[PDB]
């Protein structure tokens, strides 16, 4: 699993379940083309987005639909969504864990990169 | 001053100076059109991006060029940049302050609406 | 104003108003003795805690009563309070700004030393 | 495992390894008595701090020795350590995961509480 996403809820102190995640890869013409998508599980995690064969070097954008998540809880959020943009595998294959911590008017995202 | 940005450096414990910031507004055709831009001052703040007359309801994207900032310090960052996308409501008197806290492999952004 | 505190509310997107803050200085016998205290203003800031004459080198603890703040809003928080423990260096002109961002089950604190 | 601690390094994008953690429980006389301690593993995690039998209701303080960690990397940190103080098991046994994200002049801590 070369690309994993984990989302936590800072208001309830629990994993953010059923959060939609869309991943994009920047194409030759500087356009963001769909790459993979999914929803976080009961543990707030999303695995199996891609394979090492398909996850080649490039610039990727991970979009986390935070807005839908908060509205489903009756809270009015500030952000439309949380975005994480990074260059990946620029120097060989790496395993990426994108973690996000969510609050209505704030979020933090961290990346853990391992071999 | 309806829209203000503040950027801090969590590695050095100081404001992030001379960080380039680009703001975009989503156009009718779902395209991001340039709206305003600038660089943070010595206090890590960026004021005067727009006026209340120009800052109408809409979806905005604030892009903080974090990558250039870290490279200028000899550190290899993870993110290409930090992005904040939000809808400017305009329901009563409201000033938007977008704060960002930067680290090489992490960042947090918070919105203060007063 | 060598020591300033700023508290923000990540749930409401506003400054955390009327939050009690207690500062302690570690004494010779490794005991925490009261040093200063106050409540954040409408801007979520607390100024005038001490003077440069009184703020000498030492280990300080800034305690933010986050629990009372959340309960006053009808939310059950996780933490009893947020604590920031640091050594005031005093190596050249330096002002300390302790910023805290609050959520019911999480908080982040950052120090800006300018 | 009722009490688990996870520490990440926001500067290197990796788990914070070998970070010392001390847990205290507030005693009757309002004194902090040692409860458990350990060091984070290669994954930045610390398990087996206590058992459900021993982890009774009370106020606990989790101290993470962030200062030693940063100095061992040649960086001068701001904080002496990161502290997390909370009431636990006040309404029956719960599983607590204390997560901390570290930077030289900043840190964030989040709690995930499950049954």
From Swiss-Prot, chains A, D:
Changing residue 45 to G: In AMYLD1; amyloid polyneuropathy. Changing residue 98 to V: In AMYLD1; amyloid polyneuropathy. Its main location: secreted. Transmembrane segments: none annotated. Detected in serum and cerebrospinal fluid (at protein level). Highly expressed in choroid plexus epithelial cells. Detected in retina pigment epithelium and liver. Changing residue 107 to S: In AMYLD1; amyloid polyneuropathy. It comes from the Eukaryota. Glycans are attached at residue 89. Changing residue 43 to P: In AMYLD1; amyloid polyneuropathy. One of its GO terms (biological process) is phototransduction, visible light. Not glycosylated under normal conditions. Following unfolding, caused for example by variant AMYLD1 'Gly-38', the cryptic Asn-89 site is exposed and glycosylated by STT3B-containing OST complex, leading to its degradation by the ER-associated degradation (ERAD) pathway. Changing residue 80 to Q: In AMYLD1; amyloid polyneuropathy and cardiomyopathy. Changing residue 38 to A: In AMYLD1; amyloid polyneuropathy. GO terms for cellular component: azurophil granule lumen; extracellular exosome; extracellular region; extracellular space; protein-containing complex. L-thyroxine binds at residues 6, 45, 108. GO terms for molecular function: hormone activity; hormone binding; identical protein binding; molecular sequestering activity; protein-containing complex binding. Changing residue 49 to R: In AMYLD1; amyloid polyneuropathy. Changing residue 115 to S: In AMYLD1; uncertain significance. Keywords: Amyloid, Amyloidosis, Cytoplasm, Disease variant, Gamma-carboxyglutamic acid, Glycoprotein, Hormone, Neuropathy, Phosphoprotein, Secreted, Signal, Sulfation, Thyroid hormone, Transport. Changing residue 78 to M: Loss of tetramerization. Belongs to the transthyretin family. Homotetramer. Dimer of dimers. In the homotetramer, subunits assemble around a central channel that can accommodate two ligand molecules. Interacts with RBP4. It is linked to Amyloidosis, hereditary systemic 1: A form of hereditary systemic amyloidosis, a disorder characterized by amyloid deposition in multiple tissues resulting in a wide clinical spectrum. AMYLD1 is an autosomal dominant form due to transthyretin amyloid deposition. Protein fibrils can form in different tissues leading to amyloid polyneuropathies, amyloidotic cardiomyopathy, carpal tunnel syndrome, systemic senile amyloidosis. The disease includes leptomeningeal amyloidosis that is characterized by primary involvement of the central nervous system. Hyperthyroxinemia, dystransthyretinemic: A condition characterized by elevation of total and free thyroxine in healthy, euthyroid persons without detectable binding protein abnormalities. This is Transthyretin. It comes from Homo sapiens (Human). The lineage of its organism: Eukaryota, Metazoa, Chordata, Craniata, Vertebrata.
